[PDB]
Design a protein around this motif. Structure first.
Motif, mmCIF file in Angstrom:
data_model
loop_
_atom_site.group_PDB
_atom_site.id
_atom_site.type_symbol
_atom_site.label_atom_id
_atom_site.label_comp_id
_atom_site.label_asym_id
_atom_site.label_seq_id
_atom_site.Cartn_x
_atom_site.Cartn_y
_atom_site.Cartn_z
ATOM 1 N N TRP A 153 20.502 13.625 43.829
ATOM 2 C CA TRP A 153 20.797 15.014 43.601
ATOM 3 C C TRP A 153 22.192 14.962 43.058
ATOM 4 C CZ3 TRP A 153 19.228 13.498 48.501
ATOM 5 C CH2 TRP A 153 17.933 13.841 48.879
ATOM 6 N N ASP A 154 22.481 15.822 42.056
ATOM 7 C CA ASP A 154 23.723 15.786 41.323
ATOM 8 C C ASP A 154 24.639 16.893 41.790
ATOM 9 O OD1 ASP A 154 25.646 14.931 39.410
ATOM 10 O OD2 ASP A 154 24.214 14.952 37.722
ATOM 11 N N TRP A 155 24.334 17.537 42.951
ATOM 12 C CA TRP A 155 25.191 18.559 43.524
ATOM 13 C C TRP A 155 26.465 17.896 44.000
ATOM 14 C CZ3 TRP A 155 27.268 18.850 48.404
ATOM 15 C CH2 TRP A 155 26.650 18.151 49.438
ATOM 16 N N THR A 156 26.317 16.678 44.573
ATOM 17 C CA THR A 156 27.400 15.803 44.937
ATOM 18 C C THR A 156 27.319 14.715 43.902
ATOM 19 O OG1 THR A 156 28.531 14.604 46.730
ATOM 20 C CG2 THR A 156 26.093 14.408 46.635
ATOM 21 N N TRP A 157 28.442 14.006 43.681
ATOM 22 C CA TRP A 157 28.518 13.015 42.648
ATOM 23 C C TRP A 157 29.801 12.268 42.864
ATOM 24 C CZ3 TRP A 157 32.786 14.207 39.947
ATOM 25 C CH2 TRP A 157 33.225 13.244 39.047
ATOM 26 N N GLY A 158 30.927 12.992 43.052
ATOM 27 C CA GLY A 158 32.250 12.411 43.089
ATOM 28 C C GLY A 158 32.563 11.875 44.445
ATOM 29 N N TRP A 159 31.800 12.346 45.447
ATOM 30 C CA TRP A 159 32.001 12.028 46.827
ATOM 31 C C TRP A 159 30.627 11.697 47.317
ATOM 32 C CZ3 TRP A 159 36.890 11.495 48.321
ATOM 33 C CH2 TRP A 159 37.865 12.073 47.515
ATOM 34 N N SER A 160 29.995 10.738 46.599
ATOM 35 C CA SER A 160 28.636 10.298 46.787
ATOM 36 C C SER A 160 28.597 9.253 47.872
ATOM 37 C CB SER A 160 27.988 9.775 45.479
ATOM 38 O OG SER A 160 28.784 8.775 44.854
ATOM 39 N N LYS A 161 27.372 8.828 48.253
ATOM 40 C CA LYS A 161 27.142 7.855 49.290
ATOM 41 C C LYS A 161 26.043 6.969 48.789
ATOM 42 C CE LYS A 161 26.964 9.262 53.636
ATOM 43 N NZ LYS A 161 28.031 8.299 53.996
ATOM 44 N N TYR A 162 25.862 5.792 49.437
ATOM 45 C CA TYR A 162 24.880 4.810 49.036
ATOM 46 C C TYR A 162 23.588 5.114 49.755
ATOM 47 C CZ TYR A 162 29.089 2.233 47.603
ATOM 48 O OH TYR A 162 30.322 1.840 47.041
ATOM 49 N N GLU A 163 22.682 5.863 49.083
ATOM 50 C CA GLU A 163 21.397 6.281 49.599
ATOM 51 C C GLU A 163 20.421 5.143 49.702
ATOM 52 O OE1 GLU A 163 19.563 10.104 48.468
ATOM 53 O OE2 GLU A 163 21.269 10.327 47.062
ATOM 54 N N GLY A 164 19.459 5.287 50.643
ATOM 55 C CA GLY A 164 18.391 4.349 50.883
ATOM 56 C C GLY A 164 17.151 4.882 50.236
ATOM 57 N N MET A 165 15.986 4.313 50.623
ATOM 58 C CA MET A 165 14.688 4.722 50.146
ATOM 59 C C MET A 165 14.220 5.629 51.240
ATOM 60 S SD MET A 165 12.987 0.982 49.140
ATOM 61 C CE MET A 165 14.119 -0.180 48.329
ATOM 62 N N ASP A 166 13.967 6.919 50.921
ATOM 63 C CA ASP A 166 13.735 7.950 51.906
ATOM 64 C C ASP A 166 12.328 8.497 51.912
ATOM 65 O OD1 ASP A 166 14.441 9.331 49.433
ATOM 66 O OD2 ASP A 166 15.454 10.979 50.520
ATOM 67 N N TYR A 167 11.663 8.688 50.744
ATOM 68 C CA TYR A 167 10.319 9.249 50.711
ATOM 69 C C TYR A 167 9.382 8.100 50.498
ATOM 70 C CZ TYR A 167 12.595 13.787 50.053
ATOM 71 O OH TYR A 167 13.424 14.923 50.188
ATOM 72 N N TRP A 168 8.584 7.799 51.544
ATOM 73 C CA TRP A 168 7.665 6.691 51.613
ATOM 74 C C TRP A 168 6.250 7.179 51.658
ATOM 75 C CZ3 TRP A 168 8.780 1.318 51.968
ATOM 76 C CH2 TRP A 168 10.125 0.985 52.076
ATOM 77 N N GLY A 169 5.363 6.469 50.917
ATOM 78 C CA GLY A 169 3.929 6.645 50.873
ATOM 79 C C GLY A 169 3.237 6.287 52.165
ATOM 80 N N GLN A 170 1.999 5.748 52.070
ATOM 81 C CA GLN A 170 1.209 5.412 53.234
ATOM 82 C C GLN A 170 0.551 4.083 52.991
ATOM 83 O OE1 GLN A 170 1.177 6.811 56.168
ATOM 84 N NE2 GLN A 170 -0.173 5.080 56.827
ATOM 85 N N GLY A 171 0.429 3.681 51.707
ATOM 86 C CA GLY A 171 0.146 2.327 51.304
ATOM 87 C C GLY A 171 -1.308 1.996 51.281
ATOM 88 N N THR A 172 -1.649 1.101 50.331
ATOM 89 C CA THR A 172 -2.969 0.565 50.114
ATOM 90 C C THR A 172 -2.865 -0.896 50.435
ATOM 91 O OG1 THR A 172 -2.565 0.522 47.709
ATOM 92 C CG2 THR A 172 -4.033 2.237 48.607
ATOM 93 N N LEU A 173 -3.953 -1.472 50.994
ATOM 94 C CA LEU A 173 -3.986 -2.842 51.442
ATOM 95 C C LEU A 173 -4.561 -3.656 50.320
ATOM 96 C CD1 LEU A 173 -4.012 -5.326 53.477
ATOM 97 C CD2 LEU A 173 -6.209 -4.411 54.348
ATOM 98 N N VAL A 174 -3.817 -4.717 49.936
ATOM 99 C CA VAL A 174 -4.195 -5.655 48.915
ATOM 100 C C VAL A 174 -4.456 -6.904 49.694
ATOM 101 C CG1 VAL A 174 -3.469 -7.029 46.915
ATOM 102 C CG2 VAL A 174 -2.734 -4.604 47.177
ATOM 103 N N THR A 175 -5.592 -7.566 49.398
ATOM 104 C CA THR A 175 -5.995 -8.776 50.063
ATOM 105 C C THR A 175 -6.285 -9.718 48.942
ATOM 106 O OG1 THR A 175 -7.059 -7.485 51.793
ATOM 107 C CG2 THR A 175 -7.477 -9.872 51.797
ATOM 108 N N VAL A 176 -5.899 -10.998 49.126
ATOM 109 C CA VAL A 176 -6.137 -12.029 48.158
ATOM 110 C C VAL A 176 -6.963 -13.026 48.915
ATOM 111 C CG1 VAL A 176 -5.243 -13.715 46.545
ATOM 112 C CG2 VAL A 176 -4.050 -11.492 46.926
ATOM 113 N N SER A 177 -8.301 -12.923 48.739
ATOM 114 C CA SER A 177 -9.269 -13.752 49.412
ATOM 115 C C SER A 177 -9.491 -14.994 48.537
ATOM 116 C CB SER A 177 -10.607 -12.999 49.652
ATOM 117 O OG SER A 177 -11.560 -13.796 50.349
#
Lengths: 101, 300, 59, 125
Positions: free
Chosen positions: D101-125
């Motif tokens: 979000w560009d509301w803050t910029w000059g006094w920014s912080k080091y953000e993480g990964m916040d919005y996470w899915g639920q995931g699909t399972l991949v199998t390599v048989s």
């Protein structure tokens, strides 16, 4: 990778998870909580700043390369493999996982 | 031909004008010093908190701090009707500091304008280390550039019945130097940074509009407020300088009243221009909630 | 930029080597202005030139 | 702002497979999309990321070159395309968002990964 030694890798309550880093990474660490068979949820970005909808029990700190996540009193939502991360340098390197039994 | 003689009598309120300018300049000095000092302190403490604290902000505050700090020498000389009581070496030193820092502050504004757009588009998969490195490289480059443009004026600045310190430029280029230098100061000061300011704030407004999550947190008006404030600070002063240049080349027919008007105009607009350094902290720092929180921490 | 102390109020801060407008300013002494046929531009002339000084004193 | 994964299944080693992380909401070119794999009974490991503005990809060493990540901005969605499947790849692939979000910029912080899915399972048989 810029290695991180996350310890302990098993745990049980006053829970502290200490994560050391191989190089100085300055407040770009992240912690997580992935419930089994469910995608991770952010707990602490930067080094002490919690994400929204993350309880007050969670507490981050930076002590140089010795980052730590703190849970003063453990709750039954906290049984998950917490993964230390650093994003200061890429590649983004994850820890060894801290299972909480 | 014939020779017309225009007796130009002494203007009545010259003394009053100089007193008024000193009166404004003290306010500029106090507010600028205070604002810039607290910004530098808060900037240092924010890095501790783990913020990605911009190098540019720290630099802008420092540059403004120096410009504002060179005010008393100007005030002392101004009260004595622009007469100079200090030494030649003093004259050179004060001017160099004033010039380098003033150009540098303006340049940091320009950098920040560009940085907003880059932060929304490009820098979001870029390593923390890499972006910090880019800020540091830019910081060094701005200081160097600022130094380079300031130097020629100081070189030719020499103390010249009644004592004055006013730059004496080379014999066969007096004109050239004077006019040339001021125009460079005008363009680099206002035309180039205003253009950048307009473009990357128009783009910022468009980007925020296209977003829906952003616009909740970010005002549309404030973006254009940055553009308009920059315009207001700089345009009158440059117009006054241009009018002075026109009068010298007499594309404006001489009148004693015209001289009085120019004298007043230059002096008043000089105050307005110097208010720019005071207003720089407000736009880029004070608006942000994060700065306010840090400032509260610092205060206690 | 230069502060106004560094560029004191004069009719011209430079001099060159038809009609003349003569400015008797209490600031930067006696000054001359001289029409040019170049563009009707008018700039100051040296106020130390001898026949200039004689004309000034005469008038 | 909702992420749903479509993909997964059983695919033999040395194959390829594609996953999609459909995004409903946010502009996806003003945020970077990352993929994080949890291998069965083993730790997380970053996989890939993209900034769709300039198509500025970035991959982890393990999957470097052999995975590809490609995004579409017209409809918000990111696609992780795999190649050279192995037992190493066997994991539950989650798509995560690092937001801005560009509301803050000059006094920014080091953000993480916040919005996470639920995931699909991949199998390599």
């Amino acid at each position: 990778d810029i290695q991180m030694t996350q310890s302990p890798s098993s745990l049980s309550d006053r829970v502290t998870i200490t994560c050391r880093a191989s190089q100085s990474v300055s407040s770009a660490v992240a912690w997580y909580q992935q419930k089994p068979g469910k995608a991770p949820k952010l707990l602490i970005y930067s080094a002490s700043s919690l994400y929204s909808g993350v309880p007050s029990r969670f507490s981050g700190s930076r002590s140089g390369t010795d980052f730590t996540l703190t849970i003063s009193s453990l709750q039954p939502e906290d049984f998950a493999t917490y993964y230390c991360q650093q994003s200061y340098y890429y590649p983004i390197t994850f820890g060894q996982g801290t299972k909480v039994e | 031909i014939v020779v017309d003689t225009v007796m130009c009598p002494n203007m009545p309120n010259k003394s009053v004008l100089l007193y008024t300018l000193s009166f404004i300049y003290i306010f500029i000095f106090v507010i600028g010093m205070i604002a810039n000092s607290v910004v530098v302190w808060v900037n240092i403490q924010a890095k501790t908190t783990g913020y990605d604290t911009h190098c540019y902000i720290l630099n802008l505050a420092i540059a403004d701090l120096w410009v504002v700090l060179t005010i008393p020498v100007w005030v002392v000389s101004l009260v004595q009707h622009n007469q100079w009581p200090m030494g030649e070496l003093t004259c050179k030193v004060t001017h160099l500091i004033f010039s380098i820092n003033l150009f540098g502050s303006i340049f940091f504004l320009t950098c920040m304008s560009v940085d907003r757009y880059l932060s929304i588009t490009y820098f979001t998969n870029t390593p923390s280390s890499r972006k910090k490195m880019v800020r540091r490289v830019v910081c060094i480059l701005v200081w160097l550039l600022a130094f380079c443009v300031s130097l020629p004026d100081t070189y030719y600045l020499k103390t010249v019945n009644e004592t004055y310190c006013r730059s004496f430029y080379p014999e066969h280029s007096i004109k050239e130097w004077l006019i040339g230098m001021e125009l460079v100061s005008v363009v680099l000061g206002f035309a180039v940074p205003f253009s950048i300011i307009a473009v990357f704030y128009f783009l910022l407004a468009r980007a925020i509009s296209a977003s829906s999550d952003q616009e909740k947190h970010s005002s549309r008006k404030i973006i254009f407020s940055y553009v308009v404030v920059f315009l207001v600070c700089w345009l009158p002063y440059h117009v006054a300088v241009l009018l002075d240049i026109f009068s010298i080349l007499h594309y404006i027919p001489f009148t004693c009243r015209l001289e009085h008007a120019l004298f007043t105009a230059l002096h008043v607009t000089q105050c307005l221009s110097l208010v720019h350094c005071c207003v720089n902290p407000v736009l880029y720092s004070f608006i942000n909630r994060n700065y306010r929180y840090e400032l509260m921490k610092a205060f206690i | 930029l230069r502060h106004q102390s560094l560029s004191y109020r004069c009719p011209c801060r430079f001099f060159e080597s038809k009609h003349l407008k003569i400015l008797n300013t209490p600031n930067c002494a006696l000054q001359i202005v001289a029409r040019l046929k170049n563009n009707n531009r008018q700039v100051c002339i040296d106020p130390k030139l001898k026949w200039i000084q004689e004309y000034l004193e005469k008038a | 702002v909702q992420l749903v994964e479509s993909g997964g299944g059983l695919v033999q080693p040395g194959g390829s497979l594609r996953l999609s992380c459909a995004a409903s909401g946010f502009n996806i070119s003003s945020s970077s999309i990352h993929w994080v794999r949890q291998a069965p009974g083993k730790g997380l490991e970053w996989v890939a990321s993209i900034s769709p503005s300039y198509g500025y990809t970035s991959y982890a060493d393990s999957v470097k070159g052999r995975f590809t990540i490609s995004a579409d901005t017209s409809k918000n969605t990111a696609y992780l395309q795999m190649n050279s499947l192995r037992a190493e790849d066997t994991a539950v692939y989650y798509c995560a968002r690092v937001s801005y979000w560009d509301w803050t910029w000059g006094w920014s912080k080091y953000e993480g990964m916040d919005y996470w899915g639920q995931g699909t399972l991949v199998t390599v048989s």
